[PDB]
Amino acid sequence: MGPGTWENMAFAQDSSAINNIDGYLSYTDWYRPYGTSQDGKTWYKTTAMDWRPLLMYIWPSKDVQAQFIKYFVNNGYENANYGLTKDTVANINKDTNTTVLANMAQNLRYVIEQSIAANKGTSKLANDINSFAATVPELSASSELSLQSMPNYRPDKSGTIDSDQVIFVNNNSKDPRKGNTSYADSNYRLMNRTINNQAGNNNSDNSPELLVGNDIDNSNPVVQAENLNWEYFLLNYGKLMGYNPDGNFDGFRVDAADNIDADVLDQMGQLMNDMYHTKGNPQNANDHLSYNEGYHSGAAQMLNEKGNPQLYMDSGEFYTLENVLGRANNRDNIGNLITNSIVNRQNDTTENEATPNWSFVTNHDQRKNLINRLIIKDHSNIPDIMGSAYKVEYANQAWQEFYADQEKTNKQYAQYNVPAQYAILLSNKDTVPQVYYGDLYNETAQYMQEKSIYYDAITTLMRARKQFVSGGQTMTKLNNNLLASVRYGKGVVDANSNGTDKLSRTSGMAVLVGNDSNMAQQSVAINMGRAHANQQYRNLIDTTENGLTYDADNSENPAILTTDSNGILKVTVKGYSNPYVSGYLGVWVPVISGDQDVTTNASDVVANKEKTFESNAALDSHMIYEDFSLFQPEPTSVENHAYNVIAKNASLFSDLGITDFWMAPAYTPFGRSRYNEGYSMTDRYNLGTTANPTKYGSGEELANTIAALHKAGLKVQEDIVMNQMIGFSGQEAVTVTRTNNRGMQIHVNGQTYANQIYFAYTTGGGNGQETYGGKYLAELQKNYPDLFTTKAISTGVAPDPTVRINKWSAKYQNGTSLQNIGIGLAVKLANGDYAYLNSGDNKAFNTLLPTAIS
Ligand SMILES: [Ca+2]
């Protein structure tokens, strides 16, 4: 043919000239037309480099076509000679005559080509297309239907929107109006098989499948085998990388244990028992301490029924500590510290009865909640402040406000009574307490460069714990707002025991805590027990008008007090109000010569063939340290890498009585994640390189750091993250439905969508997944064949090691949080059929393209 408008057709009907996503077209993608023109008269053939945006030629509707014309004429593409001025486009819309819109669109293409020629390229055009698309609901975030858009929406301090989700569903249709994404189909996707609902017949917990990101299908037997691979890798990290051969993790902190198919908790325990013989052997179990993160108390029952393969997280204790001691006003009664925990500590004088558990005063998420509360308060009338309108500058402001507030007596935002919260936590029986990095150090400074105001108090308690804390526990109210928490000492079962251990006499502790800052001065009588009659006690911590004292300086009691002939200690107390104490804090320990360690060895406690973890004196001898904050800064030098700072300070952690070191998720972070902390990760096996470290450092540094901690006598756990991945670079056509966090369809402002093709980012995993994914399965099957014959509860089938996951994609995923791309990107023809390009591996339909380009 002679040259003309037919040259708008695609140069070729394949991927060499038409961008596509599994055969489907996106309105924001580009193609190579056969030719182009600046005037409608002279036409030039394209080269392979001359691509154009599809939105110059095709639109989802007449409405959007008219919007495109209007937008471009108003943003640098005006030309009166081609009938395109601000006034000629002022009133065009949906109802404009079709041939008029087509003619204006053709004329606009000529004006666009003039602009491309003037600018010697398409870079301005590309920005103008992206800017235009952002104004069209169906080609941008708003059509996804965020709960953020609802009238008078209140932002959630968690920083994520739970029920901003889409699920991936099966679609092997032959109907062109429905499309087909059968490559992403699954026979699994068993959702919400969480906690006691593992078998699908007890949803008493109602714990959700979905949190944020691309949710991994942990019911898929191939995925279950891949988790075993991943666990094996982390448990042998240094050896397997050729880094420090002692740089291997000992166990796990299990992220989001309430939001993943509970099969994976069974399977993790099975692996670690196969490898290390943990079940029925307390020494081996405790050397591989593992602990599950969760805020659902139903997990305690679940874990007990399973013989306690991991520790239960006693979140109840955290809320009790905060509600009783930490509020400014409306404090719950002091007696709640006795009863409102997974363990009742009124008179706890037995062992192997309590649910094996870990407890805390603070963790990284709780500090985050507080800071986001402050951000939301500081910047109201911003409903998307915790989504796309979040700015780091607000966090910086919040932190300045926080540090100033933390130092005050009358705190507006920060917790009251932090030292007393820790005094309770660190003296409690039947728990593994967890200390928080940000309570010892100012967590936004360079790593460990600045001690927190609370460093002296907390470390005093940490060292004293190792020396003194053992035996039975009794917690007793002394008046309506004051209690005494007493430990009777190593080998001292209760208040009437004489003691059976050489350290019985010189161990034990009294912790006095009150939460009424106006409490009248009075004398109180503390029962230290029959093992401790006529005995001298040192005033470890006492309260003063301005703070705390460690040598009885300006407090109500002297440096040493002595028990009477019954073991009663007489103490003077009153209410105080200062930055450290709102109420009262006192701690007493036996006077001793030199060093003492009341650690109970696991070889000396009862072993039970049906149990892995047991809550007894040996497990109680452990203490966890959370080594990171979300607000930890990027390091300013190699020396300031957290891994290097940790290695250099290994002896300090030992000196503080830390036995178990919880390391941040070490995975390669998604660069655009809010905190770059490692939970939003693009590669599960790359833990950083010298050239591209994570926030914390390189993999080589990590392995040397683990070895240094091992040398100091600690065990080390890695935060393992099976729930989600975030930041995949590969898009995939998936069929989706708008749901809440349980995958149930919802409406938002009366609107919904179901079974819609959506171009989610789903595909990737990096070179780490390519190299290491499934790499150890054959050797695991050879050494531990039971791993792949034990039938999982939720599915009734074993993990499947016959397929290696070298690359993640939708078939291994339950769904995703809304990705802010739009639900109407997928091109449909005027009759409703999905456009489709049959080429290469994409054979679901015959080729069907919009008339404007074929
Ligand atoms: Ca999940």
UniProtKB/TrEMBL annotation:
Enzyme Commission (EC) number: 2.4.1.5
Domain of life: Bacteria
The keyword Transferase is assigned to this record: yes
MF terms (GO), sorted A to Z: dextransucrase activity; glucosyltransferase activity; metal ion binding
Coiled-coil intervals, chain numbering: none
Residues involved in Ca(2+) binding: 209, 215, 259, 723
Catalytic activity: [(1->6)-alpha-D-glucosyl](n) + sucrose = [(1->6)-alpha-D-glucosyl](n+1) + D-fructose
Keywords, sorted A to Z: Calcium, Glycosyltransferase, Metal-binding, Signal, Transferase
All copies of domain Glycoside hydrolase family 70 catalytic, residue ranges: 54-850
GO biological process: glucan biosynthetic process
Stated family: Belongs to the glycosyl hydrolase 70 family.
Name the record gives this protein: dextransucrase
Taxon lineage: Bacteria, Bacillati, Bacillota, Bacilli, Lactobacillales
Range within the parent protein: 761 to 1614 of 1619
